[PDB]
Amino acid sequence: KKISGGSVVEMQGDEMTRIIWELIKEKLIFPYVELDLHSYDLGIENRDATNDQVTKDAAEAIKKHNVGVKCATITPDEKRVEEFKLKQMWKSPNGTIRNILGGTVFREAIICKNIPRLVSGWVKPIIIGRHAYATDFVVPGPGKVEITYTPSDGTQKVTYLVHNFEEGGGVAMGMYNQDKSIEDFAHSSFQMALSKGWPLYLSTKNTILKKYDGRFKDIFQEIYDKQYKSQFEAQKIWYEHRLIDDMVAQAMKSEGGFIWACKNYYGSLGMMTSVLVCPDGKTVEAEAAHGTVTRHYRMYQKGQETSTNPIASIFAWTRGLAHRAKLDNNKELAFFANALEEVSIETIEAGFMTKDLAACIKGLPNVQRSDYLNTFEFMDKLGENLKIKLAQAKL
Amino acid sequence: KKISGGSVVEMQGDEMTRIIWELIKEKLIFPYVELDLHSYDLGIENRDATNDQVTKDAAEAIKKHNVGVKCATITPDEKRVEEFKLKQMWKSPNGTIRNILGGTVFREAIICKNIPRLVSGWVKPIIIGRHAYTDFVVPGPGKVEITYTPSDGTQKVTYLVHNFEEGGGVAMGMYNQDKSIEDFAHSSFQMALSKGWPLYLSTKNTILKKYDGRFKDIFQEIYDKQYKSQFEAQKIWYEHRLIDDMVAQAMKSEGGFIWACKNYGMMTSVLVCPDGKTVEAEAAHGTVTRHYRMYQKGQETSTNPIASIFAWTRGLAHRAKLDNNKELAFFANALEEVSIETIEAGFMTKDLAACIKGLPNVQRSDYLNTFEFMDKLGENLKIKLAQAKL
Ligand SMILES: Cc1ccc2c(c1C)N(C(=O)Nc1ccc(C(C)(C)C)cc1)Cc1cccnc1N2
Ligand SMILES: Cc1ccc2c(c1C)N(C(=O)Nc1ccc(C(C)(C)C)cc1)Cc1cccnc1N2
């Protein structure tokens, strides 16, 4: 009576994250869900052996099957090349995948009642998305710096005067943003808001950048009114623009559970996701915000006890599986993903947590061994509680 | 015999912050320290009556006496204008003072062992300072470029920012003067010397080779030419790091450093002028209108005065550093210690108790109202100064 998941692209990672990735697969995903997996080993040894071809293949597989779950991988550096005898310093796999797929990264945090957070009034999680992919020069002495735009259809050149240096030099810069990138950011933001069922809020200081940020607001409103308005009204959700100063004041006294889309001109506690949403609203790429956890991997190699938080990695699987279920209309898979998120949260709230989580409640030095469980005990408790939850749900 | 403080400019605030400001003055500062006060009422009613002239006079008094402590004030808006019948919605007093004085704002956090931290490893506070200070829509395809025509007659240098392909978009041009960077560097070094902590300049110069490379160059040359000897004498160092390398080192650190970053109730905002003599301290929180309305309704209030107390201590510490006063410097540090120890001992306000016991699991016995907390602080301060006379 296994749940038929469907086509999901999975990628193995490195060090402690690879170990916990195998643990989540063997204990939580495989015993209940049967998938048409497209496994790709993104381990530094396999990446070196295939000349980083496996990353390009995995990215192509995601573009074809729209669902991809990724484990934490190492970005090579000088010491890493010497450590693994790497042929060359390969580029970050996340960067390659992001370049091939394209889209906006939305970071969601996992909130537990007993876990202390800033504000403390935020019961529901917050999703924040920043737009992403500049020319600079040094001004030697006094002069006049100005930006010009000559249209490639005759017309007339427009000269704006950025500044007039009278005493002393300095430095000047000039950036830009294409309309297609803003349109894609707007589409990704609206599709994320529809997938999560939460209201969207665009925050920008349009008072300072009247034409720059005013354009952002105009494109967002144009797309909202032309396609997503009816869908937003049907699900009781709404889109409202707000100023950065007004937005932070509104958010601090609000409930939570809102998609915040902010303009780009970390919290690696193991409680955050990094969902890449493509503008088409069909291709997703879920991964954990934290790194490979090398510190714990060294202890694991030495045979020492480790207490690693797998919540971010589990939530990366649940988000990918929820998106797969939403695409293929799989009620059972969607329920399974929600059940796994609930078992995770409830287990932490019940008192069973790792050392990093217990360090917040009892204090980092005051953490005793009885207060927390090591990686394997926590995963075993999660599996036990998951089995119980699914057994009780067959009613 | 009270400690001889000296010339300090004090600016009265509004609402709950004004109430706690009067409480700190009458209970913690005046009974032990005798000051040459230069009081200025920055109340919305006084600001309206004088046509915001009091703000300019207070800013001038700060420039003259080099030390200023400010209480939280209201920034007018539509609702405030209607409720107070204002003549005109005045500019933010902080903006006016910042324009007259200049300088860099450094935000410092107050750390207590029992209070949960954003980073578990941070035991000592970290000070963060940011550098604070033309756009247009591109209708269709074209070529946007930035030009520079020197005033000495040399040839104009043109840099292509983007040749707009199919479809337009939007563009902008930013600038920064050398004097602003020089003043930011001086303020950062003087702050690091006053706190006795190492300074770290963090920026992403890989992308901005010329822009952020200039920042690193100016900060390297003022440090090497003037502040190197003073930094070496006090065992302090200045190291420039990339933003991605800086977050990795800072995460694995106990704190206690001055972080100067260039921008692309437990916080104190200290404005440090480039001259290293003028400092304006203030609490990094609002007027607390939510508690003032309860106060007006006769309801019990539990407001945290730690940020306001720390604004006084920082101003008094800077005054002591200028006048070479050992007694006043000790008093300011003693007041910070009594504040921290009182919170750590279990005596705290409702907002602080909400972090340790959980917001919904907070009972009356766990916290004290504004007056009880101030009385406990005063009692413990008296004890601390009595024990220190050895
Ligand atoms: C990247 C990211 C994603 C999601 C979340 C966060 C972060 C950092 N966090 C957060 O407080 N965002 C935040 C909100 C406001 C600010 C201010 C102070 C600048 C106004 C700063 C950070 C963690 C947090 C905790 C509890 C509930 N939700 C969240 N969501
Ligand atoms: C404005 C400000 C100034 C100083 C401080 C803070 C804030 C908010 N705080 C803080 O957590 N800043 C912080 C800085 C960097 C990061 C990174 C690592 C994500 C880049 C995270 C938080 C409060 C805090 C608490 C304990 C000890 N020091 C501080 N200093």
Curated annotation (Swiss-Prot), chain A:
This is Isocitrate dehydrogenase [NADP] cytoplasmic. Binds 1 Mg(2+) or Mn(2+) ion per subunit. One of its GO terms (cellular component) is peroxisomal matrix. Acetylation at Lys-355 dramatically reduces catalytic activity. Mn(2+) binds at D245. Keywords: Acetylation, Cytoplasm, Glyoxylate bypass, Magnesium, Manganese, Metal-binding, NADP, Oxidoreductase, Peroxisome, Phosphoprotein, Tricarboxylic acid cycle. It comes from Homo sapiens. Its EC number is 1.1.1.42. GO terms for biological process: 2-oxoglutarate metabolic process; female gonad development; glutathione metabolic process; glyoxylate cycle; isocitrate metabolic process; NADP metabolic process; NADPH regeneration; regulation of phospholipid biosynthetic process. Its main location: cytoplasm. It is linked to Glioma: Gliomas are benign or malignant central nervous system neoplasms derived from glial cells. They comprise astrocytomas and glioblastoma multiforme that are derived from astrocytes, oligodendrogliomas derived from oligodendrocytes and ependymomas derived from ependymocytes. Genetic variations are associated with cartilaginous tumors such as enchondroma or chondrosarcoma. Mutations of Arg-130 to Cys, Gly or His abolish the conversion of isocitrate to alpha-ketoglutarate. Instead, alpha-ketoglutarate is converted to R(-)-2-hydroxyglutarate. The modification Phosphotyrosine is found at Y40. The record marks K205 as: Critical for catalysis. InterPro entries: IsoCit/isopropylmalate_DH_CS, Isocitrate_DH_NADP, IsoPropMal-DH-like_dom. It catalyses: D-threo-isocitrate + NADP(+) = 2-oxoglutarate + CO2 + NADPH. One of its GO terms (molecular function) is magnesium ion binding. Pfam families: Iso_dh (PF00180).
Swiss-Prot record, chain B:
The record marks K204 as: Critical for catalysis. It is an enzyme of class 1 (oxidoreductase). Substrate binds at T75, S92, P93, N94, G95, T96, I97, R98, R107, R130, K204. Acetylation at Lys-350 dramatically reduces catalytic activity. The modification Phosphotyrosine is found at Y40. Mn(2+) binds at D244. InterPro entries: IsoCit/isopropylmalate_DH_CS, Isocitrate_DH_NADP, IsoPropMal-DH-like_dom. The modification N6-acetyllysine is found at K79, K216, K225, K235, K297. Gene3D superfamilies: Isopropylmalate Dehydrogenase. PROSITE patterns: IDH_IMDH. GO terms for biological process: 2-oxoglutarate metabolic process; female gonad development; glutathione metabolic process; glyoxylate cycle; isocitrate metabolic process; NADP metabolic process; NADPH regeneration; regulation of phospholipid biosynthetic process. Keywords: Acetylation, Cytoplasm, Glyoxylate bypass, Magnesium, Manganese, Metal-binding, NADP, Oxidoreductase, Peroxisome, Phosphoprotein, Tricarboxylic acid cycle. One of its GO terms (cellular component) is cytosol. Binds 1 Mg(2+) or Mn(2+) ion per subunit. One of its GO terms (molecular function) is cadherin binding. Its main location: cytoplasm. Its cofactor is Mg(2+); Mn(2+). The modification N6-succinyllysine is found at K124, K376. Its EC number is 1.1.1.42. It is found in: Cytoplasm, Cytosol; Peroxisome. PANTHER family: ISOCITRATE DEHYDROGENASE [NADP] CYTOPLASMIC, NADP-SPECIFIC ISOCITRATE DEHYDROGENASE. It is linked to Glioma: Gliomas are benign or malignant central nervous system neoplasms derived from glial cells. They comprise astrocytomas and glioblastoma multiforme that are derived from astrocytes, oligodendrogliomas derived from oligodendrocytes and ependymomas derived from ependymocytes. Catalyzes the NADP(+)-dependent oxidative decarboxylation of isocitrate (D-threo-isocitrate) to 2-ketoglutarate (2-oxoglutarate), which is required by other enzymes such as the phytanoyl-CoA dioxygenase. Plays a critical role in the generation of NADPH, an important cofactor in many biosynthesis pathways. May act as a corneal epithelial crystallin and may be involved in maintaining corneal epithelial transparency. NCBIfam families: nadp_idh_euk, PRK08299.1. Homodimer. This is Isocitrate dehydrogenase [NADP] cytoplasmic. It comes from Homo sapiens.
